[PDB]
RNA sequence: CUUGAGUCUCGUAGAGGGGGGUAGAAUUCCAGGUGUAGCGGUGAAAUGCGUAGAGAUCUGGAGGAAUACCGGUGGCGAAGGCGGCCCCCUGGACGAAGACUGACGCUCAGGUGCGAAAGCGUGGGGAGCAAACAGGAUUAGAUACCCUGGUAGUCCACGCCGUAAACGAUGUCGACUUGGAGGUUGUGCCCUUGAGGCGUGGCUUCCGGAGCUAACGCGUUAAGUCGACCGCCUGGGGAGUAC
RNA sequence: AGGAGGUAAAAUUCUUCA
RNA sequence: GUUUAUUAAAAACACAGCACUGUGCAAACACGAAAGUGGACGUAUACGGUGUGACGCCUGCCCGGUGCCGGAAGGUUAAU
């Protein structure tokens, strides 16, 4: 059970479903006695370059202490979900707070 | 025919010939002109002056649309890289923007070799 | 520098074109140099730091 | 790379290229691929950067 | 590389007590543990040669350790091979 | 899976089997079977119109659906069967209504998948839908030329088509032959590739290995006599004639394509 | 018995290795709109390409392969060798103290395993590049250098080949021997009160001592000074060939 | 002063012993 | 293996394999004045023609004549 950054961006059209994503996500994690130290939602933020057409996406920061199991089967949900655009999990090194 | 005012100057200077094409804000090309098309064969067109007259050649063929101002996107090094944009300005065109669009790959394709001279 | 999210600190370590500035100018430290570069690489992917100014 | 001049001038004044791209990284990836040969070149030049 | 949970667990089964991981039985024990763990690791991929010499080094290590133990006290040798399950 | 038999005997050492473990073993689905006799290369006049047709092992037909009209109705692939009539493998899928139909089992197909057809079917192998809804570039097999007819393009094994154009109500498809023919997007198609691809890795091994398939021996024009074949008979391996058919038709380059009807539906011939 | 060699707790750095995905740029191919006799190429030209509309330009899509900048006598590994990003699995090395095992060590014929590129077998794929080959130039001659095209190959899965200037042309391990300038990775102490100050280890780079050597040079990482073990040489050609 | 970029087209052969 | 049933059973023919080429479906081709049918109730890993003839190493030089596949300024040119 290690930490994972996790910082995906949902399509601007599916912004009303975003608040729901965090629900199932946090639920699936807590289901396996997972953890959670930080969860931020910068909201519809500007983009650096025209990614998959359309400008400005909906970013949603994350920080969970889930095992290297439920986290591996997490990207499969993102890839399958055409709603979300990008996705990335990074390092571990203990947990953090606020910032950004 | 037509009557635009804002266009673009897509030039492509190389180590051999320099092609200049004045298009619109949509990129459909209104008129072009090469350094070789106006004569100068071989090293003759491989010079900055070849591009100078070339620009004037493209200019005296696109003014029919009343092109007041137009952007300029340079592409490809070699001669006629600076003298080219130095012509349109003296031709009577209102230079606005000048951006470089030289194809720079992040190391992908394999370049040639044969050059032992 | 010590992170990638702190773009407010990595925006002054890169040229206008986005190219990572060498330690020769920034005068940055050793271990801190690669870390600074490693942070930029992560930011770029997350669309935090444009790879080029062409955009 | 790009330049957005003011008003009181027409001269290029775009000497930014002579400090980044232009040919500083274009001429390099122009001819042969070199590969391992560069090391000897840089090592040779670096040996002359001392005195 | 073998969780610290299993390591300390094995040490408290071969040696007289804790902190006695230096014991020959403890070493050969903690070594075989990996040899059996990585055993399944190589079962997959099978193209990992760099990490292959490591596993071989581990076995070649305990092997020499066995000859030593067998050299000194023979009883401690048998009570180890039959328990740990090896040598055949 | 490919297998290379050992030289246990002559005509068996040059054999390369192409079996498949994920292939059903037994009798097919009776409800989807029929007579399907064997002509023999002869027509109603009993004249052998097509030469080299005869013998072969007894075969049966498999009711395969190429139209795929069952839209909005999911289906699960029960198993994969062998279809002698074709070179590709068929898949006995079972829809949620209880109806079973055969379809060209795609490359990435397995037993227990959920395929479906319709202008709402997800872009994946095994699904069928009009090219007007299928993204450009998407590799598709069993393409149709007319809306409602049925898949007729890329039906063999390992073969496939690739949509690479739109414009109007048509789309240009890159046939496996290398030709790009235009077809109205109104025509449906099935994403992904066709069946197996190891079908071309076969080499039989012996002559008799081609007899029970439906092919008969081949005779050369040089071996035959002039009264039989234009290449004459000769008096010791002779020719002096031009490579033509046994009916007086130039070959080895001589094109014989006359249509002018579908030439418009053509962009660039093969090469 | 513990100083050699290991284990244990915690922590740190890394193009180390293997597997599975992913993103952007560019080139090529293809499609649409606009546009029209040139394009392309060289030292100069030509072959080639183009009125079935190229090149150029704008937009979109597919595919392959490699990852610009970072990037450096910088880092890692036994050597070969190894560069985007992320996940999973995993080897080894190293450091701060203490504790434990207690020579359990070093090397090592046979044998065994690994091992760039090229090549080969069974398949797939194949943008670019590119032996052979084809067509133009150069030339006294051009089966070459140059240009236009282009197959095998390069890529991927599996099974072989085990060959190189496979070099640092120096085998590996341990001990000892004046120093100076840097790189890189931990750690102790001090108004942390300067981004540092004052020390102590591992590794690496250049120069320079004694000494050594035929000289060139090497020079605390030795080719210095010694010890252990294994391999190897006895003129060149023949030949890394014959049996 | 430091750094970066640019800058050359082909042209064979010469006995043996002192 | 096949073949001159009834003087030739052979180095001939066939042969898996390989190669070139034609073929985008109402296919090419073939039987037919036509309809129609076969090819195929198949779809380029398919089919037809030709050539050679397991495999192993390989398969060079040459485009005038005679053909095939394209383009094309000028010239000649039927019926109307």
């Amino acid at each position: 059970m290690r930490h994972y950054e996790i910082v995906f961006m949902v399509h601007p059209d599916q912004s009303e479903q975003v608040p729901g994503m965090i629900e199932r996500y946090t639920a699936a994690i807590t289901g396996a006695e997972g953890k959670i130290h930080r969860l931020e939602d910068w909201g519809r933020r500007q983009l650096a370059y025209p990614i998959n057409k359309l400008h400005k996406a909906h970013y949603v920061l994350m920080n969970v202490e889930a095992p290297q199991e439920v986290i591996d089967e997490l990207e499969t949900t993102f890839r399958f979900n055409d709603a979300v655009i990008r996705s990335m999990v990074m390092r571990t090194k203990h947990a953090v707070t606020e910032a950004s | 025919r037509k009557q635009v005012s804002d266009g673009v100057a897509h030039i492509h200077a190389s180590f051999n010939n320099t092609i200049v094409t004045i298009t619109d804000r949509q990129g459909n090309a209104l008129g072009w002109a090469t350094a070789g098309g106006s004569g100068f064969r071989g090293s003759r067109k491989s010079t900055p002056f070849a591009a100078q007259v070339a620009a004037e050649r493209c200019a005296d063929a696109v003014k029919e649309y009343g092109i007041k101002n137009l952007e300029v996107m340079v592409k490809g090094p070699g001669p006629g890289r600076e003298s080219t944009i130095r012509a349109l300005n003296a031709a009577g065109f209102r230079i606005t923007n000048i951006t470089d669009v030289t194809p720079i790959p992040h190391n992908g394709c394999r370049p040639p070799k044969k050059r032992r001279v | 520098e010590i992170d990638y999210k702190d773009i407010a600190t990595l925006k002054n370590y890169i040229t206008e074109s986005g190219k990572i500035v060498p330690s020769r100018i920034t005068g940055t430290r050793a271990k801190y140099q690669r870390q600074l570069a490693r942070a930029i690489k992560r930011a770029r992917y997350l669309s935090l730091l444009p790879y080029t100014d062409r955009h | 790379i790009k330049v957005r001049e003011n008003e009181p001038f027409d001269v290029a004044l775009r000497r930014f290229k002579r400090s980044c791209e232009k040919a500083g990284v274009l001429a390099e990836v122009r001819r042969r691929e070199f590969y391992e040969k560069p090391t000897t070149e840089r090592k040779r030049a670096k040996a002359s950067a001392v005195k | 590389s073998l969780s610290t949970e299993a390591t300390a667990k094995i040490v408290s089964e071969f040696g007289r007590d804790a902190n006695d991981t230096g014991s020959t039985e403890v070493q050969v024990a903690l070594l075989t543990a990996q040899i059996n763990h990585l055993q399944g690791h190589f079962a997959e991929h099978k193209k990992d040669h760099h990490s292959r010499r490591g596993l071989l080094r581990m076995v070649s290590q305990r092997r020499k350790l066995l000859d030593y133990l067998k050299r000194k006290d023979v009883a401690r040798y048998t009570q180890l091979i039959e328990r740990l399950g090896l040598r055949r | 899976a490919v297998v290379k038999c050992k030289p246990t005997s002559p005509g068996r050492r040059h054999v390369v089997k192409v079996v498949n473990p994920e292939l059903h073993k037994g009798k097919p689905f009776a409800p989807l079977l029929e007579k399907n006799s064997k002509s023999g290369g002869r027509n109603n006049n009993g004249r052998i119109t097509t030469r080299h047709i005869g013998g072969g092992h007894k075969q049966a037909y498999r009711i395969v659906d190429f139209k795929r009209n069952k839209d909005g109705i999911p289906a699960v692939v029960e198993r994969l069967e062998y279809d002698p009539n074709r070179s590709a493998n068929i898949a006995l899928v079972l829809y949620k209504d209880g109806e079973r139909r055969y379809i060209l089992a795609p490359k990435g197909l397995k037993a227990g998948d959920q395929i479906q057809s319709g202008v709402d079917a997800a872009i994946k192998p095994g699904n069928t839908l009009p090219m007007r809804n299928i993204p450009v570039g998407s590799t598709v097999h069993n393409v149709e030329m007319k809306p409602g007819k049925g898949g007729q393009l890329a039906r063999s094994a390992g073969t496939y088509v690739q949509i690479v154009a739109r414009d109007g109500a048509y789309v240009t498809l890159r046939l496996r032959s290398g030709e790009m023919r235009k077809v109205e997007a109104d025509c449906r198609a099935t994403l992904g590739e066709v069946g197996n691809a190891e079908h071309m890795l076969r080499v039989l091994g012996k002559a008799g290995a081609a007899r029970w398939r439906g092919v008969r021996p081949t005779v050369r024009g040089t071996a035959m006599n002039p009264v039989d074949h234009p290449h004459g008979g000769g008096e010791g391996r002779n020719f002096g004639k031009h490579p033509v058919t046994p009916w007086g038709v130039q070959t080895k380059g001589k094109k014989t394509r006359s249509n002018k009807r579908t030439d418009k539906f053509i962009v660039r011939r093969r090469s």
Side-chain angles (χ1 to χ4, degrees), chain D residues 8 10 12 15 18 20 23-24 26 29 31-32 34 39 41-45 50-51:
Chain D
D10 298 359
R15 279 58 181 177
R18 300 298 181 298
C20 299
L26 188 169
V29 188
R31 268 213 56 183
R32 189 175 184 178
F34 291 58
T39 60
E41 181 178 359
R42 283 60 180 178
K43 180 180 297 180
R44 181 69 296 180
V50 56
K51 295 297 298 300

Side-chain angles (χ1 to χ4, degrees), chain E residues 19-62:
Chain E
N19 300 300
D20 185 60
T21 182
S23 179
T24 302
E25 289 68 293
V26 181
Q27 299 184 61
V28 182
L30 56 71
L31 295 176
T32 302
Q34 292 296 62
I35 302 177
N36 296 304
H37 184 182
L38 289 61
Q39 188 65 297
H41 168 57
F42 292 65
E44 185 180 60
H45 300 177
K46 301 179 62 180
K47 188 58 66 293
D48 186 359
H49 300 300
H50 295 61
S51 300
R52 181 175 297 297
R53 180 184 59 172
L55 179 60
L56 191 172
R57 179 181 179 297
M58 299 181 91
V59 182
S60 60
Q61 181 180 180
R62 66 172 183 178

Side-chain angles (χ1 to χ4, degrees), chain B residues 32-101:
Chain B
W32 56 285
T34 62
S38 304
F40 308 120
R41 305 304 301 179
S43 60
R44 293 284 60 182
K45 61 177 181 178
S46 300
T47 59
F49 180 61
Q52 180 181 300
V53 60
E56 300 172 58
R57 286 282 298 181
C58 184
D60 192 299
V62 298
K63 295 180 178 299
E64 289 64 292
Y65 300 119
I67 302 177
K68 300 180 63 180
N69 63 300
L70 65 173
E71 302 70 62
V72 181
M73 302 182 98
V74 181
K75 179 181 296 180
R81 177 182 177 63
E82 303 298 62
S83 60
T84 175
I85 56 76
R86 189 182 307 299
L88 293 302
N89 187 183
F93 296 119
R94 178 63 180 298
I95 188 286
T96 302
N97 301 300
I98 301 178
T99 303
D100 181 297
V101 297

Side-chain angles (χ1 to χ4, degrees), chain F residues 65-71 104 117-118 127-132 134 140-155 161 163 169-173 175 181-191 265:
Chain F
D65 180 59
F66 301 67
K67 300 180 180 180
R68 302 298 297 296
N69 301 300
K70 300 297 297 180
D71 305 302
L104 295 64
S117 61
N127 297 57
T128 302
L129 62 170
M131 300 180 270
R132 59 181 179 181
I134 301 178
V140 182
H141 65 299
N142 183 60
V143 184
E144 303 180 0
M145 297 183 267
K146 298 182 180 300
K149 181 184 297 180
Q152 300 181 301
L153 300 177
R155 297 176 56 179
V161 183
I163 306 178
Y170 284 60
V171 295
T172 302
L173 301 306
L175 302 174
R181 185 179 183 298
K182 299 180 62 60
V183 181
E184 56 183 300
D186 298 300
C187 302
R188 298 183 178 181
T190 304
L191 289 296
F265 298 64

Side-chain angles (χ1 to χ4, degrees), chain A residues 30-47:
Chain A
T30 58
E33 299 181 0
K35 302 297 180 180
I36 177 177
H37 297 180
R38 186 177 65 179
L39 183 287
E40 300 180 59
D41 182 2
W42 303 305
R44 297 173 296 297
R45 188 178 184 298
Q46 180 61 60
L47 298 176

